[PDB]
Amino acid sequence: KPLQVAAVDSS
Amino acid sequence: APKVVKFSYMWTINNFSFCREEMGEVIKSSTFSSGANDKLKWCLRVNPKGLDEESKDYLSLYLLLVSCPKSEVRAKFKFSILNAKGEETKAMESQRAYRFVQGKDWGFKKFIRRDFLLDEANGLLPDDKLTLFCEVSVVQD
């Protein structure tokens, strides 16, 4: 699994 | 010409290993603002154990517009972790400006895998503290 995912979203 | 105000905030989460086990925990920073003196208050929001099942292996990190009396504010943002030497690492930026309204956040559901964070060799929880650095660039109408 990626260490970090740079996809931006809103909670 | 858009008019842009840059500001930042450093947040240390102490006693990181005392975060709740059950999923759903939210931790928030104190509020912060630019000098622009426009009534906008922001904070950081962390889910130490992810927002949901798909993200349970990650820490999630968001920028929240806590207070804003105007309809909307656009802002770019960047988050970094400060390592055991005080330097920025593992940063991610939003790239473009996102549209905030009061109570809205934007950020990274999968900011960093927790097993990397908890591996002492990476030096990211020195003394059981997680230090995060947020830089914001807000558009002022």
Numbering used by the authors:
A (entry chain B): -2 to 8
B (entry chain A): 26 to 166
From the primary publication:
The adaptor protein, speckle-type BTB/POZ protein (SPOP), recruits substrates to the cullin-3-subclass of E3 ligase for selective protein ubiquitylation. SPOP recruits substrates via its N-terminal MATH domain, whereas a central BTB domain mediates dimerization and interactions with Cul3. Here, we show that MyD88 interacts with SPOP through a long degron that contains the established SPOP-binding consensus and an N-terminal site that we name the Q-motif. We determine the structural basis of these interactions and show that the Q-motif interacts with an unexplored binding pocket on the SPOP MATH domain.
MyD88 interacts with SPOP through a sequence (134VDSSV138; MyD88 SBC) located between the death- and TIR domains. The side chains of MyD88 Leu129 and Gln130 sit in a hydrophobic pocket that is contributed by SPOP residues Phe136, Ile137, and Phe141, with the side chain of Gln130 also forming hydrogen bonds with the backbone carbonyl groups of SPOP Lys115 and Phe136. The +5 residue of the MyD88 SBC (Val138) differs from the defined consensus. MyD88 Val138 cannot make these contacts, and instead, the backbone NH group of MyD88 Arg140 forms a hydrogen bond with the side chain of SPOP Asp77, thereby directing the C-terminus of the MyD88 peptide in a different direction from that observed in other SPOP substrates. This suggests that the residues located C-terminal to the SBC are highly flexible, as observed in structures of other SPOP substrates.
